[PDB]
Short mmCIF file of N, CA and C in Angstrom, two decimals:
data_model
loop_
_atom_site.label_atom_id
_atom_site.label_comp_id
_atom_site.label_asym_id
_atom_site.label_seq_id
_atom_site.Cartn_x
_atom_site.Cartn_y
_atom_site.Cartn_z
N UNK W 1 0.60 -1.47 -0.02
CA UNK W 1 0.05 -0.25 0.13
C UNK W 1 1.23 1.45 -0.39
N UNK W 2 1.34 1.31 0.79
CA UNK W 2 2.32 2.21 1.19
C UNK W 2 3.26 3.02 0.45
N UNK W 3 3.96 3.91 -0.26
CA UNK W 3 5.25 4.15 -1.13
C UNK W 3 6.25 2.93 -0.90
N UNK W 4 6.80 3.41 0.42
CA UNK W 4 7.96 2.36 1.01
C UNK W 4 8.02 1.10 0.29
N UNK W 5 6.53 0.37 0.82
CA UNK W 5 6.28 -1.15 0.46
C UNK W 5 6.52 -1.07 -1.16
N UNK W 6 6.02 -0.19 -1.97
CA UNK W 6 6.22 0.10 -3.28
C UNK W 6 7.52 -0.47 -3.72
N UNK W 7 8.16 1.19 -2.71
CA UNK W 7 10.07 1.03 -2.91
C UNK W 7 10.26 -0.62 -2.65
N UNK W 8 9.78 -1.14 -1.60
CA UNK W 8 10.65 -2.71 -1.05
C UNK W 8 10.32 -3.38 -2.17
N UNK W 9 8.76 -4.05 -2.84
CA UNK W 9 9.08 -4.62 -3.20
C UNK W 9 9.74 -4.40 -4.75
N UNK W 10 9.07 -3.17 -5.60
CA UNK W 10 10.15 -2.61 -6.45
C UNK W 10 11.77 -3.65 -6.75
N UNK W 11 12.76 -3.62 -5.44
CA UNK W 11 13.95 -3.67 -5.34
C UNK W 11 13.98 -5.19 -5.27
N UNK W 12 12.99 -5.61 -3.83
CA UNK W 12 13.07 -7.00 -4.17
C UNK W 12 13.26 -7.60 -5.46
N UNK W 13 11.77 -6.93 -6.05
CA UNK W 13 12.34 -7.61 -7.72
C UNK W 13 13.04 -7.74 -8.66
N UNK W 14 13.82 -6.20 -8.17
CA UNK W 14 14.74 -5.28 -9.48
C UNK W 14 16.23 -6.68 -9.07
N UNK W 15 16.20 -7.14 -7.15
CA UNK W 15 17.03 -8.11 -6.81
C UNK W 15 17.01 -9.47 -7.31
N UNK W 16 16.06 -9.89 -7.89
CA UNK W 16 15.44 -10.91 -8.15
C UNK W 16 15.78 -11.25 -9.79
N UNK W 17 15.58 -10.01 -10.40
CA UNK W 17 15.76 -9.75 -11.81
C UNK W 17 17.19 -10.33 -11.55
N UNK W 18 18.22 -9.57 -11.34
CA UNK W 18 19.72 -9.88 -11.27
C UNK W 18 20.00 -10.84 -11.52
N UNK W 19 19.42 -11.74 -10.31
CA UNK W 19 20.08 -12.71 -10.41
C UNK W 19 19.53 -13.72 -10.71
N UNK W 20 18.60 -13.88 -11.98
CA UNK W 20 17.76 -14.56 -12.97
C UNK W 20 19.32 -13.82 -14.17
N UNK W 21 19.39 -12.73 -14.21
CA UNK W 21 20.23 -13.00 -15.51
C UNK W 21 21.57 -13.21 -15.05
N UNK W 22 22.23 -13.38 -14.05
CA UNK W 22 23.42 -14.35 -14.30
C UNK W 22 23.19 -15.66 -14.56
N UNK W 23 21.77 -16.42 -14.49
CA UNK W 23 21.75 -17.72 -15.39
C UNK W 23 21.65 -17.67 -15.94
N UNK W 24 20.56 -16.34 -16.92
CA UNK W 24 20.00 -16.61 -18.61
C UNK W 24 21.63 -16.02 -19.19
N UNK W 25 22.67 -15.51 -18.22
CA UNK W 25 23.71 -14.93 -19.38
C UNK W 25 25.06 -16.09 -19.54
N UNK W 26 24.48 -17.35 -18.40
CA UNK W 26 25.37 -18.41 -18.48
C UNK W 26 26.11 -18.70 -19.88
N UNK W 27 27.73 -18.45 -19.83
CA UNK W 27 27.84 -19.07 -21.07
C UNK W 27 28.34 -20.25 -22.08
N UNK W 28 28.10 -21.97 -20.45
CA UNK W 28 28.17 -23.09 -20.83
C UNK W 28 27.46 -23.52 -21.92
N UNK W 29 27.70 -23.76 -23.00
CA UNK W 29 26.91 -24.04 -24.44
C UNK W 29 26.92 -25.71 -24.53
N UNK W 30 27.60 -26.46 -23.38
CA UNK W 30 27.38 -28.00 -23.45
C UNK W 30 28.90 -28.43 -24.32
N UNK W 31 29.30 -29.49 -24.14
CA UNK W 31 30.48 -29.96 -24.29
C UNK W 31 30.18 -31.26 -24.84
N UNK W 32 29.20 -31.89 -25.19
CA UNK W 32 28.51 -33.11 -25.87
C UNK W 32 27.25 -33.24 -25.78
N UNK W 33 26.82 -33.71 -26.81
CA UNK W 33 25.00 -33.53 -26.89
C UNK W 33 24.25 -34.07 -25.61
N UNK W 34 24.40 -34.81 -25.17
CA UNK W 34 24.16 -35.44 -23.40
C UNK W 34 23.99 -34.19 -22.75
N UNK W 35 25.16 -33.49 -22.59
CA UNK W 35 25.51 -31.85 -21.99
C UNK W 35 24.11 -31.20 -22.91
N UNK W 36 24.80 -31.08 -24.00
CA UNK W 36 23.49 -29.80 -24.71
C UNK W 36 22.39 -29.95 -24.29
N UNK W 37 21.74 -31.61 -24.14
CA UNK W 37 20.64 -31.68 -24.47
C UNK W 37 20.03 -31.34 -23.05
N UNK W 38 20.57 -31.79 -22.13
CA UNK W 38 20.53 -31.13 -20.78
C UNK W 38 20.51 -29.83 -20.66
N UNK W 39 21.29 -28.66 -21.02
CA UNK W 39 21.41 -27.21 -20.91
C UNK W 39 20.63 -26.97 -21.85
N UNK W 40 19.86 -28.09 -22.51
CA UNK W 40 18.91 -26.67 -23.27
C UNK W 40 17.74 -26.82 -22.75
N UNK W 41 17.15 -28.23 -21.91
CA UNK W 41 15.91 -28.79 -21.70
C UNK W 41 15.74 -27.50 -20.49
N UNK W 42 16.54 -27.87 -19.45
CA UNK W 42 16.57 -26.77 -18.38
C UNK W 42 16.56 -25.28 -18.63
N UNK W 43 17.36 -25.01 -19.83
CA UNK W 43 16.93 -23.76 -19.96
C UNK W 43 15.30 -23.28 -20.42
N UNK W 44 14.75 -24.56 -20.70
CA UNK W 44 13.75 -24.08 -21.51
C UNK W 44 12.63 -23.93 -20.13
N UNK W 45 12.66 -24.58 -19.65
CA UNK W 45 12.05 -24.94 -18.12
C UNK W 45 12.47 -23.55 -17.08
N UNK W 46 13.21 -23.47 -17.32
CA UNK W 46 13.96 -21.91 -16.13
C UNK W 46 13.68 -20.73 -16.89
N UNK W 47 13.55 -20.48 -18.40
CA UNK W 47 12.64 -19.12 -19.45
C UNK W 47 11.39 -18.80 -19.18
N UNK W 48 10.58 -20.21 -19.14
CA UNK W 48 9.41 -20.15 -18.78
C UNK W 48 9.06 -19.64 -18.12
N UNK W 49 9.65 -20.70 -16.33
CA UNK W 49 9.13 -20.25 -15.17
C UNK W 49 9.91 -18.99 -15.17
N UNK W 50 10.41 -18.15 -15.30
CA UNK W 50 11.05 -17.09 -14.72
C UNK W 50 10.11 -15.89 -16.21
N UNK W 51 9.48 -15.81 -17.08
CA UNK W 51 9.00 -15.58 -17.85
C UNK W 51 7.55 -15.52 -17.33
N UNK W 52 7.21 -16.12 -16.76
CA UNK W 52 5.58 -16.24 -15.78
C UNK W 52 5.64 -15.80 -14.93
N UNK W 53 6.26 -15.83 -13.98
CA UNK W 53 6.56 -15.59 -12.42
C UNK W 53 7.17 -13.75 -12.98
N UNK W 54 7.96 -13.30 -13.05
CA UNK W 54 8.08 -12.13 -13.07
C UNK W 54 7.40 -11.46 -14.31
N UNK W 55 6.62 -11.50 -15.03
CA UNK W 55 5.83 -10.79 -15.88
C UNK W 55 4.87 -10.29 -15.22
N UNK W 56 3.79 -11.74 -14.55
CA UNK W 56 2.91 -11.27 -13.12
C UNK W 56 3.30 -10.19 -12.26
N UNK W 57 5.19 -10.23 -11.52
CA UNK W 57 5.22 -9.36 -10.56
C UNK W 57 5.61 -7.77 -11.17
N UNK W 58 5.76 -7.99 -12.56
CA UNK W 58 5.93 -6.60 -12.81
C UNK W 58 4.42 -6.08 -13.47
N UNK W 59 4.13 -7.24 -13.69
CA UNK W 59 2.78 -6.05 -14.22
C UNK W 59 1.66 -5.72 -12.97
N UNK W 60 2.33 -5.95 -11.82
CA UNK W 60 1.45 -5.81 -10.67
C UNK W 60 1.86 -4.30 -10.25
N UNK W 61 3.37 -4.45 -10.35
CA UNK W 61 4.33 -2.84 -10.11
C UNK W 61 3.60 -2.16 -10.69
N UNK W 62 3.88 -1.93 -12.65
CA UNK W 62 2.88 -1.51 -13.42
C UNK W 62 2.16 -0.99 -13.25
N UNK W 63 1.03 -1.95 -12.83
CA UNK W 63 -0.64 -1.64 -12.35
C UNK W 63 -0.64 -0.18 -11.37
N UNK W 64 -0.05 -0.65 -10.26
CA UNK W 64 -0.18 0.18 -9.65
C UNK W 64 0.39 1.68 -9.12
N UNK W 65 1.65 1.63 -9.73
CA UNK W 65 1.77 2.98 -9.78
C UNK W 65 1.23 3.71 -11.00
N UNK W 66 0.77 3.43 -12.07
CA UNK W 66 -0.05 3.94 -13.47
C UNK W 66 -1.20 4.17 -12.41
N UNK W 67 -1.89 3.71 -11.62
CA UNK W 67 -2.77 3.51 -11.45
C UNK W 67 -3.15 5.03 -10.27
N UNK W 68 -1.64 5.05 -9.47
CA UNK W 68 -1.16 5.99 -8.80
C UNK W 68 -1.04 7.19 -9.34
N UNK W 69 -0.23 7.48 -10.40
CA UNK W 69 0.17 8.78 -11.37
C UNK W 69 -1.13 8.96 -11.92
N UNK W 70 -2.28 8.22 -12.39
CA UNK W 70 -3.68 8.14 -12.99
C UNK W 70 -3.92 9.64 -12.23
N UNK W 71 -3.82 9.23 -10.89
CA UNK W 71 -4.47 9.62 -9.33
C UNK W 71 -4.46 10.82 -9.19
N UNK W 72 -3.23 11.31 -9.87
CA UNK W 72 -2.93 12.42 -9.86
C UNK W 72 -1.84 12.60 -8.18
N UNK W 73 -1.37 11.69 -8.26
CA UNK W 73 -0.14 11.11 -6.54
C UNK W 73 0.99 12.06 -7.41
N UNK W 74 0.92 13.04 -5.96
CA UNK W 74 2.24 14.15 -5.76
C UNK W 74 3.52 13.67 -6.00
N UNK W 75 3.93 12.36 -5.92
CA UNK W 75 4.96 11.96 -6.01
C UNK W 75 5.22 10.94 -7.27
N UNK W 76 4.16 11.60 -8.30
CA UNK W 76 3.87 11.08 -9.93
C UNK W 76 5.73 10.70 -10.16
N UNK W 77 6.19 11.71 -10.55
CA UNK W 77 7.51 11.60 -10.76
C UNK W 77 8.32 10.67 -10.15
N UNK W 78 8.54 10.21 -8.95
CA UNK W 78 9.38 9.81 -8.87
C UNK W 78 9.25 8.58 -8.51
N UNK W 79 7.59 7.75 -8.94
CA UNK W 79 7.34 6.58 -9.24
C UNK W 79 7.10 6.08 -10.66
N UNK W 80 7.40 6.84 -11.71
CA UNK W 80 7.50 6.80 -12.51
C UNK W 80 8.98 6.36 -12.89
N UNK W 81 9.28 7.04 -12.82
CA UNK W 81 11.19 6.70 -12.06
C UNK W 81 10.96 4.74 -11.85
N UNK W 82 10.59 4.95 -11.19
CA UNK W 82 11.03 2.99 -10.27
C UNK W 82 10.27 2.15 -11.63
N UNK W 83 9.48 2.62 -12.33
CA UNK W 83 8.55 2.28 -13.13
C UNK W 83 9.57 1.73 -13.80
N UNK W 84 10.22 2.84 -14.71
CA UNK W 84 11.11 2.83 -15.84
C UNK W 84 12.24 2.10 -15.43
N UNK W 85 12.77 2.28 -14.51
CA UNK W 85 14.21 1.19 -14.14
C UNK W 85 13.49 -0.24 -14.16
N UNK W 86 12.09 -0.82 -13.71
CA UNK W 86 12.14 -1.77 -13.41
C UNK W 86 11.82 -2.28 -15.02
N UNK W 87 11.02 -1.60 -15.85
CA UNK W 87 11.18 -1.57 -16.98
C UNK W 87 11.69 -2.09 -17.96
N UNK W 88 13.20 -1.76 -17.36
CA UNK W 88 13.68 -1.58 -18.54
C UNK W 88 15.12 -3.09 -17.51
N UNK W 89 15.14 -3.09 -16.97
CA UNK W 89 15.90 -4.46 -16.37
C UNK W 89 15.44 -5.70 -16.99
N UNK W 90 14.14 -5.61 -16.78
CA UNK W 90 12.98 -6.74 -16.78
C UNK W 90 13.30 -7.07 -18.65
N UNK W 91 12.98 -6.03 -19.40
CA UNK W 91 13.29 -5.93 -20.94
C UNK W 91 14.67 -6.66 -21.06
N UNK W 92 15.88 -6.36 -20.16
CA UNK W 92 17.78 -6.49 -20.27
C UNK W 92 17.50 -7.87 -20.27
N UNK W 93 16.50 -8.78 -19.47
CA UNK W 93 16.87 -9.77 -18.78
C UNK W 93 16.02 -10.72 -19.74
N UNK W 94 14.46 -10.16 -20.14
CA UNK W 94 13.84 -11.54 -21.39
C UNK W 94 15.10 -11.38 -22.44
N UNK W 95 15.86 -10.40 -22.88
CA UNK W 95 16.81 -9.94 -24.48
C UNK W 95 17.87 -11.40 -23.64
N UNK W 96 18.03 -11.33 -22.43
CA UNK W 96 19.63 -12.50 -22.31
C UNK W 96 18.89 -13.65 -22.37
N UNK W 97 17.67 -13.55 -22.24
CA UNK W 97 16.80 -15.22 -22.18
C UNK W 97 16.64 -15.52 -23.56
N UNK W 98 16.30 -14.42 -24.40
CA UNK W 98 16.20 -15.07 -25.67
C UNK W 98 17.31 -15.00 -26.86
N UNK W 99 18.44 -14.51 -26.24
CA UNK W 99 19.63 -15.15 -26.72
C UNK W 99 20.23 -16.02 -26.18
N UNK W 100 20.24 -16.54 -24.64
CA UNK W 100 21.09 -17.80 -24.60
C UNK W 100 20.03 -19.09 -25.17
N UNK W 101 18.65 -18.35 -25.09
CA UNK W 101 17.87 -19.73 -25.63
C UNK W 101 17.89 -19.84 -27.53
N UNK W 102 18.73 -19.08 -27.99
CA UNK W 102 18.62 -19.34 -29.36
C UNK W 102 20.59 -20.04 -29.32
N UNK W 103 21.50 -19.53 -28.77
CA UNK W 103 22.88 -20.02 -28.62
C UNK W 103 22.34 -21.55 -27.70
N UNK W 104 21.89 -21.91 -26.99
CA UNK W 104 21.64 -23.25 -26.97
C UNK W 104 21.04 -23.88 -27.99
N UNK W 105 20.32 -23.45 -28.67
CA UNK W 105 19.45 -24.01 -30.17
C UNK W 105 20.50 -24.68 -31.04
N UNK W 106 21.36 -22.90 -31.17
CA UNK W 106 22.69 -23.15 -32.19
C UNK W 106 23.53 -24.67 -31.52
N UNK W 107 23.99 -24.58 -30.48
CA UNK W 107 24.56 -26.00 -29.88
C UNK W 107 24.45 -26.81 -29.86
N UNK W 108 23.07 -27.12 -30.35
CA UNK W 108 22.08 -28.62 -29.79
C UNK W 108 21.92 -29.00 -31.17
N UNK W 109 21.87 -28.41 -32.47
CA UNK W 109 21.67 -28.58 -33.55
C UNK W 109 23.48 -28.99 -34.24
N UNK W 110 24.71 -28.43 -33.64
CA UNK W 110 25.78 -28.72 -34.01
C UNK W 110 26.52 -29.96 -33.12
N UNK W 111 26.55 -30.08 -31.90
CA UNK W 111 26.46 -31.23 -31.34
C UNK W 111 25.74 -32.71 -32.02
N UNK W 112 24.35 -32.20 -32.39
CA UNK W 112 23.60 -33.24 -32.83
C UNK W 112 23.90 -33.65 -34.23
N UNK W 113 24.64 -32.43 -34.75
CA UNK W 113 25.69 -33.10 -36.71
C UNK W 113 26.77 -34.04 -36.14
N UNK W 114 27.53 -33.61 -35.35
CA UNK W 114 28.69 -34.57 -34.98
C UNK W 114 28.19 -35.94 -34.70
N UNK W 115 27.23 -35.95 -34.24
CA UNK W 115 26.61 -37.04 -33.28
C UNK W 115 26.20 -37.95 -34.65
N UNK W 116 25.28 -37.25 -35.75
CA UNK W 116 25.01 -38.24 -36.26
C UNK W 116 26.04 -38.44 -37.59
N UNK W 117 27.06 -37.42 -37.78
CA UNK W 117 27.86 -37.44 -38.58
C UNK W 117 27.95 -39.55 -38.35
N UNK W 118 28.50 -40.20 -36.76
CA UNK W 118 29.27 -40.71 -36.23
C UNK W 118 28.74 -41.97 -36.45
N UNK W 119 27.01 -41.52 -36.24
CA UNK W 119 26.14 -42.62 -36.53
C UNK W 119 26.12 -42.70 -38.00
N UNK W 120 26.24 -42.20 -38.73
CA UNK W 120 26.00 -42.34 -40.37
C UNK W 120 27.51 -43.00 -41.08
N UNK W 121 28.69 -42.50 -40.24
CA UNK W 121 29.88 -43.13 -40.98
C UNK W 121 30.08 -44.69 -40.26
N UNK W 122 29.30 -44.56 -39.08
CA UNK W 122 28.95 -46.35 -39.12
C UNK W 122 27.76 -46.78 -39.86
N UNK W 123 27.04 -46.45 -40.20
CA UNK W 123 26.15 -46.64 -40.95
C UNK W 123 26.38 -47.51 -42.39
N UNK W 124 26.89 -46.54 -42.95
CA UNK W 124 27.70 -46.57 -44.82
C UNK W 124 28.68 -48.05 -44.68
N UNK W 125 29.76 -47.86 -43.30
CA UNK W 125 29.89 -48.74 -42.98
C UNK W 125 29.81 -50.27 -42.67
N UNK W 126 29.04 -50.52 -41.87
CA UNK W 126 28.25 -51.40 -42.13
C UNK W 126 27.58 -51.78 -43.58
N UNK W 127 27.62 -51.08 -43.87
CA UNK W 127 26.97 -51.56 -45.19
C UNK W 127 27.49 -51.76 -46.49
N UNK W 128 28.95 -51.06 -46.40
CA UNK W 128 30.06 -51.83 -47.15
C UNK W 128 30.70 -53.35 -47.12
N UNK W 129 30.84 -53.52 -45.46
CA UNK W 129 30.89 -54.72 -45.25
C UNK W 129 30.57 -55.67 -45.89
N UNK W 130 29.68 -56.09 -46.04
CA UNK W 130 28.57 -56.72 -46.40
C UNK W 130 28.81 -56.54 -48.15
N UNK W 131 29.55 -57.10 -48.85
CA UNK W 131 29.61 -57.10 -50.14
C UNK W 131 28.98 -58.38 -51.00
N UNK W 132 28.19 -58.49 -51.27
CA UNK W 132 27.32 -59.58 -51.75
C UNK W 132 28.04 -60.05 -53.18
N UNK W 133 20.02 -61.27 -54.99
CA UNK W 133 20.08 -61.93 -54.08
C UNK W 133 17.95 -61.50 -54.07
N UNK W 134 17.61 -62.41 -52.82
CA UNK W 134 16.56 -62.27 -52.02
C UNK W 134 16.35 -60.79 -52.13
N UNK W 135 17.52 -60.52 -50.56
CA UNK W 135 17.45 -59.49 -49.66
C UNK W 135 17.88 -58.32 -51.19
N UNK W 136 18.28 -58.55 -51.80
CA UNK W 136 18.68 -57.34 -52.62
C UNK W 136 17.43 -56.05 -52.64
N UNK W 137 16.28 -56.39 -52.49
CA UNK W 137 15.39 -55.45 -52.94
C UNK W 137 15.41 -54.31 -51.41
N UNK W 138 16.01 -54.80 -50.21
CA UNK W 138 16.36 -54.54 -48.70
C UNK W 138 17.50 -53.79 -48.69
N UNK W 139 18.34 -54.16 -49.12
CA UNK W 139 19.71 -53.45 -50.13
C UNK W 139 18.98 -52.38 -50.75
N UNK W 140 18.48 -52.12 -52.03
CA UNK W 140 17.83 -51.66 -53.05
C UNK W 140 17.60 -50.13 -52.26
N UNK W 141 16.09 -50.00 -51.48
CA UNK W 141 15.57 -49.18 -50.54
C UNK W 141 17.02 -48.53 -49.92
N UNK W 142 16.87 -49.34 -48.44
CA UNK W 142 18.06 -49.25 -47.48
C UNK W 142 18.99 -48.06 -48.59
N UNK W 143 19.78 -48.77 -49.09
CA UNK W 143 20.64 -48.17 -49.60
C UNK W 143 20.32 -46.15 -49.94
N UNK W 144 19.69 -46.30 -51.03
CA UNK W 144 18.89 -45.63 -51.25
C UNK W 144 18.46 -44.02 -50.52
N UNK W 145 17.86 -44.74 -48.96
CA UNK W 145 17.50 -43.34 -47.90
C UNK W 145 18.73 -43.42 -47.31
N UNK W 146 20.05 -43.89 -47.49
CA UNK W 146 20.94 -43.21 -46.82
C UNK W 146 21.86 -42.25 -48.04
N UNK W 147 21.42 -42.43 -49.61
CA UNK W 147 21.94 -41.20 -50.44
C UNK W 147 20.58 -39.96 -50.17
N UNK W 148 19.59 -40.59 -49.13
CA UNK W 148 18.92 -38.69 -48.69
C UNK W 148 19.49 -38.40 -47.44
N UNK W 149 20.06 -39.65 -46.51
CA UNK W 149 20.25 -38.85 -45.37
C UNK W 149 21.49 -38.12 -45.58
N UNK W 150 22.49 -38.89 -46.37
CA UNK W 150 23.86 -37.89 -46.54
C UNK W 150 23.54 -36.78 -47.48
N UNK W 151 22.57 -36.68 -48.13
CA UNK W 151 21.88 -34.82 -48.67
C UNK W 151 21.36 -34.63 -47.27
N UNK W 152 20.94 -35.32 -46.93
CA UNK W 152 20.60 -34.03 -45.54
C UNK W 152 21.78 -34.25 -44.93
N UNK W 153 22.56 -35.11 -44.51
CA UNK W 153 23.50 -34.35 -43.65
C UNK W 153 24.28 -33.23 -44.32
N UNK W 154 24.82 -33.24 -45.77
CA UNK W 154 25.25 -32.40 -46.41
C UNK W 154 24.82 -30.80 -46.09
N UNK W 155 23.34 -30.83 -46.13
CA UNK W 155 22.45 -29.75 -46.45
C UNK W 155 22.49 -28.91 -44.73
N UNK W 156 22.64 -29.80 -43.56
CA UNK W 156 22.99 -29.13 -42.43
C UNK W 156 24.60 -29.27 -42.39
N UNK W 157 25.34 -29.64 -43.03
CA UNK W 157 26.47 -29.04 -43.07
C UNK W 157 26.95 -27.73 -43.60
N UNK W 158 26.31 -27.30 -45.11
CA UNK W 158 25.91 -26.50 -45.46
C UNK W 158 25.22 -25.33 -44.95
N UNK W 159 24.56 -25.55 -43.88
CA UNK W 159 24.02 -24.38 -43.56
C UNK W 159 24.57 -24.25 -41.99
N UNK W 160 24.98 -25.12 -41.37
CA UNK W 160 25.38 -24.92 -39.95
C UNK W 160 27.17 -24.10 -39.97
N UNK W 161 28.16 -24.34 -41.57
CA UNK W 161 28.97 -23.57 -41.66
C UNK W 161 28.30 -21.90 -41.94
N UNK W 162 27.60 -21.57 -42.15
CA UNK W 162 27.21 -19.96 -42.25
C UNK W 162 27.32 -19.46 -40.94
N UNK W 163 27.06 -20.94 -39.94
CA UNK W 163 27.65 -19.48 -38.62
C UNK W 163 28.22 -20.06 -37.45
N UNK W 164 29.43 -19.98 -38.73
CA UNK W 164 30.60 -20.37 -37.84
C UNK W 164 31.85 -20.23 -38.66
N UNK W 165 33.03 -19.58 -38.67
CA UNK W 165 34.17 -19.91 -39.20
C UNK W 165 35.31 -20.36 -38.12
N UNK W 166 36.70 -19.81 -38.93
CA UNK W 166 37.84 -20.68 -38.04
C UNK W 166 37.79 -22.19 -38.25
N UNK W 167 38.17 -22.40 -36.90
CA UNK W 167 38.44 -23.57 -36.73
C UNK W 167 36.87 -24.55 -36.12
N UNK W 168 35.89 -24.25 -35.76
CA UNK W 168 34.77 -25.08 -35.66
C UNK W 168 34.42 -25.13 -37.61
N UNK W 169 33.80 -24.29 -38.09
CA UNK W 169 33.81 -24.24 -39.48
C UNK W 169 34.21 -25.30 -40.13
N UNK W 170 35.68 -25.24 -40.08
CA UNK W 170 36.73 -26.09 -40.25
C UNK W 170 36.08 -28.06 -39.84
N UNK W 171 35.57 -27.46 -38.52
CA UNK W 171 35.30 -29.20 -38.28
C UNK W 171 33.88 -29.65 -38.72
N UNK W 172 33.23 -28.71 -38.95
CA UNK W 172 31.99 -28.93 -39.61
C UNK W 172 31.89 -30.04 -40.60
N UNK W 173 33.00 -29.04 -41.39
CA UNK W 173 33.22 -29.02 -42.80
C UNK W 173 34.10 -30.40 -43.41
N UNK W 174 35.18 -30.79 -42.55
CA UNK W 174 36.12 -32.04 -42.24
C UNK W 174 34.66 -32.86 -42.08
N UNK W 175 33.90 -32.69 -41.30
CA UNK W 175 33.25 -34.33 -40.66
C UNK W 175 32.40 -34.51 -42.34
N UNK W 176 31.52 -33.60 -42.77
CA UNK W 176 30.75 -33.55 -44.15
C UNK W 176 32.43 -34.22 -44.94
N UNK W 177 33.16 -33.90 -45.46
CA UNK W 177 33.53 -34.55 -46.24
C UNK W 177 34.13 -35.81 -45.43
N UNK W 178 34.51 -36.32 -44.79
CA UNK W 178 34.58 -37.27 -44.52
C UNK W 178 33.61 -38.79 -44.77
N UNK W 179 31.97 -37.90 -44.20
CA UNK W 179 31.57 -38.85 -44.58
C UNK W 179 31.26 -39.04 -46.44
N UNK W 180 31.34 -37.65 -47.08
CA UNK W 180 30.40 -37.79 -48.42
C UNK W 180 31.75 -38.71 -48.97
N UNK W 181 32.94 -38.98 -48.76
CA UNK W 181 34.29 -39.50 -48.86
C UNK W 181 33.47 -41.61 -48.11
N UNK W 182 33.06 -41.58 -47.47
CA UNK W 182 32.92 -43.28 -47.38
C UNK W 182 32.16 -42.92 -48.08
N UNK W 183 30.42 -42.57 -48.00
CA UNK W 183 29.18 -43.01 -49.17
C UNK W 183 30.13 -42.86 -50.75
N UNK W 184 31.12 -41.78 -51.18
CA UNK W 184 31.82 -41.93 -52.31
C UNK W 184 32.11 -43.33 -52.50
N UNK W 185 33.28 -44.22 -51.49
CA UNK W 185 33.54 -45.10 -51.58
C UNK W 185 32.51 -46.55 -51.43
N UNK W 186 31.48 -45.91 -50.60
CA UNK W 186 30.32 -47.25 -51.04
C UNK W 186 30.22 -47.08 -52.39
N UNK W 187 29.51 -46.41 -52.77
CA UNK W 187 28.48 -46.57 -54.46
C UNK W 187 29.69 -46.82 -54.95
N UNK W 188 31.13 -46.54 -55.37
CA UNK W 188 31.58 -46.95 -56.23
C UNK W 188 32.46 -48.48 -56.07
N UNK W 189 32.26 -49.24 -54.58
CA UNK W 189 32.20 -50.70 -54.11
C UNK W 189 30.99 -51.42 -54.81
N UNK W 190 29.71 -51.45 -55.03
CA UNK W 190 28.56 -51.75 -55.54
C UNK W 190 28.33 -50.91 -56.45
N UNK W 191 29.83 -51.30 -57.49
CA UNK W 191 29.63 -51.04 -58.64
C UNK W 191 29.37 -50.21 -59.44
#
């Protein structure tokens, strides 16, 4: 009710926001596919809960300050400033969250990419070892799917490379060339 309580309420909330910003600012993007999977899922929960709880609190402060200003409270100037600072911190936090969410998604896709690469390297391999029938048609369709999946892998490699340079980009490209060479040798193998 009182202005002192409003101030305190505003102060506690801004303090709460500052803590959330610390979490939303984490640089940890994960070092393997499991790790990034965990970070990504954890962050989604964090963003959702933080957003919902935070927005209600900000709204309530905004509503009460706005009513007081509307009613011509003599301290409208002081409380409007409180409102402005609060809204600026909240917006900073939301931007931090959006950013981290996107970066975690990029890291997810990158680790997923290398994870798939290995999967594919093994799969072509398991299909090269078999050097031949009645199950020819199972080999036919199966093999073709790879053509499409290796094609898909190449497509991912193409997209990811526009997101990175230097060593990361090089890593992405090396893995793609390694898969394309495995595939190419398989094809050549099967006459």
